[PDB]
Symmetry: C5
Subunit: 376 residues, 5 copies
């Protein structure tokens, strides 16, 4: 993920202009090959027209160029790009939100699956490892970068996500369908066993674990569904064909004609279509947004960092349920125990934020008349 949230904290003078000097995740990186190809075809026809074609041939070419410039309908392309890329971006953010995290589960497991002894550690660590394992299986199913990390189940077993015994159980399942759900059913069964052994002290806590498991499993399944159910291929081919039709019309119709011939609208020869190359860069970048975001679990630059999230989720979950279980600092009175009001100090940098009026509501400046304040 190319994060530039810091560069755009404040609407500054440079603002988005400075973002034009970034290379990773950029439009330049995604589009320079297509821009050179577009420019190569344009200068190939330019060289043909200037040096190769004869006078009759040049006249015919100019008639074709005037004809093709008519069909460079940028409004249809802008419409269909707008709608398609809006769909793809929304789907992209939905896919990011559908990635499983153990955060709700780790809060619930640290709060509900009890025991300072090795068994309690085993239960808590095993419940999160199941959650992490379900996440890893679905990600290696849907992510190229996680597949290259875990090309085999042996790789998942060596990485500590799955034990050898769990690998035997997992392979011995006679299922021809993706088994990402298997750790989730193991999690259900183990949470039931924990509640039967009294490690979960109450039936509502078991219900809370199973609710949070169901949310987690839902996210893993949603990843699977987004992977399988692509943005319809007809819809994609339609937008690609739209853009390419526009660029063929721009590749022929934006050819600079001889000012000698005195064609209307063709009286200046810049030899390079600056504005047509910028339109190409704009529209092709707009489609490259969809191209990058259509499968966000590839290995792009704005593609999701699925291997970083796997490592973070594992380490954090294990901290939360093993090192931070029942490891509270002693309840001691906070700084504002004796103070009726409560306000942390402000730094010299942000002290200016003080003395700005505290918002109470829009209606607290009306200043009615005395007569209008009396009830009926």
């Amino acid at each position: 993920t190319v994060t530039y949230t810091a560069r755009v904290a404040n609407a500054r003078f440079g603002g988005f202009s400075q973002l034009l000097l970034l290379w990773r995740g950029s439009i330049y990186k995604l589009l320079w090959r297509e821009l050179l190809c577009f420019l190569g075809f344009y200068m190939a026809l330019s060289a043909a027209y200037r040096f190769v074609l004869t006078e009759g041939q040049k006249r015919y070419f100019e008639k074709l160029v005037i004809y093709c410039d008519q069909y460079a309908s940028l409004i249809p392309v802008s419409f269909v790009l707008g709608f398609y890329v809006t769909l793809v971006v929304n789907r992209w953010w939905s896919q990011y939100l559908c990635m499983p995290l153990p955060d709700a589960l780790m809060c619930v497991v640290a709060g509900t699956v009890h025991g300072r002894d090795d068994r309690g550690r085993l239960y808590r660590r095993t419940l999160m490892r199941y959650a992490g394992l379900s996440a890893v299986l679905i990600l290696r199913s849907v992510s190229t970068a996680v597949f290259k990390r875990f090309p085999t189940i042996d790789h998942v077993v060596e990485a500590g996500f799955m034990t050898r015994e769990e690998r035997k159980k997992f392979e011995n399942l006679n299922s021809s369908y993706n088994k990402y759900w298997v750790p989730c059913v193991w999690f259900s069964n183990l949470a039931a066993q924990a509640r039967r052994e009294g490690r979960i002290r109450d039936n509502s806590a078991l219900k809370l674990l199973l609710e949070e498991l169901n949310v987690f499993r839902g996210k893993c399944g949603m990843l699977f569904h987004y992977d399988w159910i692509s943005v319809p291929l007809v819809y994609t081919q339609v937008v690609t064909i739209a853009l390419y039709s526009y660029f063929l019309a721009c590749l022929i119709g934006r050819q600079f004609l001889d000012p000698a011939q005195g064609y209307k609208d063709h009286d200046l020869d810049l030899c390079v279509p600056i504005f047509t190359l910028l339109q190409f860069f704009f529209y092709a970048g707009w489609l490259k947004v969809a191209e990058q975001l259509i499968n966000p679990f590839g290995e792009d630059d704005d593609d999701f960092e699925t291997n970083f999230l796997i490592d973070r989720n594992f380490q954090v979950s294990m901290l939360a349920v093993d090192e931070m279980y029942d490891d509270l600092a002693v309840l001691e009175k906070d700084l504002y125990w004796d103070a009726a009001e409560a306000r942390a100090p402000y730094t010299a940098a942000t002290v200016f934020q003080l003395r700005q009026p505290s918002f109470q509501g829009s209606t607290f400046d009306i200043t009615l008349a005395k007569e209008d304040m009396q009830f009926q």
Copy 2:
């Protein structure tokens, strides 16, 4: 479902261009008949104008062609297609998400409906079979492909989803309305019976089953509502009439006139309207996206694979509640038991992802001054 998620993992040079060489689920497959019809009418008028019509008749035709080219308003068509097809695509994804799956139920039933004996197997397998049966009834109601698979309730009984006794109970219901809800009320009653027999060990687990059943039943009902409440037929007729009005204006106005007559904008005769055929292909494909997605449970190529999902859901649910019930590998210490930090190994392919700075937040590079860090 034509899944091309792998082909678009990374925004590559080929990118969407290579997707133009796919046939299944493609714009070519959905639109070649309409393209040949469009082209047939265009060349029928072309042949009429070139060989059949007389000189007066040819002049009149050219006046009509110039008149019709005025009315080829592509911006209204792009607007209404954009809005209608956006509606249809959103509805299509909603319908996919409203398809019932037993995944939440199987986690809950493996976790809550207990017993290693044949009765416990019966209860768990029967609860999921009820869920699968409710799904099959609604799908054969809404899916053409599942109806051809299950043309009669006898077919559902032979497929193992409904017993003969359950068929007698199901037919003996005096209801003239679709009975997809019947297995869900059977599921409610059986979960109640399981909780009364103590197979469900706690009242919260029964509540969890009924919550998950209600979600499942909601999905089945939602499938029914999407099937019944079509995208309004007036709205569809409006977009079809829009597109056909544009194509009639393009079918007459894009006719190539004699350059001899010296009509403005008509001075080149290509004999085939490359750009008009591409516009037709673009706009008709855009409407074909809605046509394919308007009922996603047909038997298209991007239509949902409802028979695959039926088979997967059945097999997986039965595995989850029968073979994987209380079948945990023994709790043993994972690979990272003694390690304070936790990190799976990375392959040579994805080791490059390492040594990239771990994201902490946008604000961790501000580097304030010493004086501005002091509290007031």
Copy 3:
């Protein structure tokens, strides 16, 4: 509801074209009067110009027609129609989803309110009748078709939804506000009484009933809010005025002038504006979509079938809680008891769906090198 989901299962050659031959729910039915009025004004001005107006008068008219054709800005109308009708369609689908159904409640009541005796039947049937009665009161408040069915509370009492005693209690409430919520408070009280008498066996089941009641009551209230809070009348008047301004500009500017006068763009006289009538039909149909969907509980053809839903909901709910309570077929082993895998047979029609590769994930065809598979 005009359901055409079957006609559009597959993207066929005819496809949406055949939908142009439907009359119910159609654009023709909704728009033929307005089309004849538009055409009547157009031919009234045509007859005035051709036979009534003098030569000076004809010249002035032609100057006015050329002036008015300038103002036929179809892009603003397409924008505002797009946005307004998108709002109205989204609101329409939201209103359909906000119609109350007893399906969650009937699953919960069959599962939670117990007793084979007449009292248990009374409790279950009375809880659903309360839910159905709340639905009927709000629908007769918001639906014209249900109001014509239930013009008085006496009509609701005769229909079996409300008893005479319940009518006395319902009228004796000193409330000047719509009392659709009254059965919901009766449902709350009766569920409490059932739980006190032990008919609901656990406090979590009572909580489940009250949760499902709250969802039901929320839907009824949402119907009330959608009825009361119309799409803002300023926004509607704006789109109606937009469309009518465009049609006045098209009614004057699309008048066919004498080719004799040799006006530019006016050199052919078709005597009937085919393309202008199609634009009128397109844009007026687009607004007629909003007109039909703005109050979906009227008595149109795409308006919701609220009387069918009332009858279905009542019959089904009563079946679910009375005839199907504790009426399970005996738990017997299903067809796939002894089979490790589970797969229903496929028909000759849909056997082709088999032998298509089972989807596992996008990443299962990468085929890495041996060296890149090794961990660091």
Copy 4:
């Protein structure tokens, strides 16, 4: 709220046209001053050009008018209005849905907080009064109309929402932030006290009360957030400046020039720009939709009726928890006790809805062949 849901039940011939004859909540009411101002500037320049400016001055003015007509870009204005007003309308409906209602709470309190005696009445009535008081405090914070009704906390105390003792407790809180949340914490504490005294008979019912309280409090807080976090002022200034730029270009460029001068496109002098005034009325009404809906808690005509909702919510909640507590009609057999099927009678007006085929699903008309029905 100007409710016209009845007038638009059916898509009638008059339809939206008759809505153009409404004054309250109308575009006329919101825009006649701006229309007269626009028209006053237009006729001021018209009078200047016709009677005041000299021949040279008139020529210069006409050059300026032709120049300004070029810049009347209606497509950008339509784009930005569309997007901004769509944002404002969505926000408006969200704000309406975020208004607190006690309906879920009253169902839960009538069902959970028990006692026929004065103490039970006190507890139920006090819990709803707290909810109503939280609603009144946030509304007087965000609503102008409720602020004019409750200009002081003394006004809330006189209205019966807050007792004098509760006023002392409420003022004695050392908080400089809006205290709308205070009754919600009182509600939490009182529900806890009720559950401790056994007035709430079970811990799940207390959980249900607190869940419903949290939803209520969330709605009150959401009202506060929508009040505080305005639609960004830069975004508003952008759309206002867009519209005013268009209207300045239309105010100069739509000036009728002398047909004598023989300017192209300026050959008819209507002395009043009918179509330009309609465009002004259309676009300014479109922005007036946002202007009316941007703060829906003002005192407009489409602004929310917050004082009606306060009175309804109070009266209804008090009925629900005080007069209708444990006040059921005796469980007696309904009209359809002995009938296997269940169907209320239909009136002569709506009997036509009968005999229309009952919808079962799209797939129930396929009519397969005998050979295709056989399983593999």
Copy 5:
């Protein structure tokens, strides 16, 4: 946050016009530098053309200006701005809703974590301080203004959010990932300890605390995800390049040419492009909306007031759980105890709202015939 909700309560004559006179949060403040730069380049080329360029050079420049005016395609820019800025505004409101507040937690903790003694105060105050501390850690991670307030964890410790002991525990965690989740796991553990000590009186109340904690923690994590997963940098660069391409075409093509040369469309020389500067101001302000809203936790004027929310949330939460715990005014009969109906008095200002008909539903004015009211 620049709140102008009061200024736009009613759609007044001034309305949005008066909002053009605001400076904070305004388009003027965000855009005057860019406007002066645009104007500086425009007048630099104007001075070059008028005084510096020779006659041949002036002719060439005018040919370039006519060429560049062709490429000033405002419709593509309006499309892509519309879609991108709509995305950014929606994301901005989502980010505001994803900011954590303790309001649900404070209601639940005041209602569930009991004890008037110092230990109960410690538990309640410590649970909210954990919630506030989790909020402060994530905000200092994502907010520049909170980072300048809390540049170090020492600053958080001095502000009273974290104790020294909690700081030792927090630093001793071997995690390389952002530790905003740490107080949430402390909250889970402490709520478990409270429930074990009997301070939480029931298991459902513990479940309610953990549910509300999970919502809170979800909001904190969502803040982290929005911070990390920027709006794709390719999409931003595309819109910035679009706007800058349009402004370069407007910077050259909107240059005023000599009326002497008699170029079409260039016959008036205003020396300052009023309308082009307004278009620049409109489009650049439209992009400045995204620029301001793209990271709403900066230190702008419409950026969120994160330091005010930190102070409010802390003070209010501590009031709610410490000063207002079990501090109810004595249950006494409200003003409407003996009144069957319930209605607060109305002021002279808002008494006009009375006598307006109380809304009952759209269907209560149909006035059917006697014969049509009879059941079949």
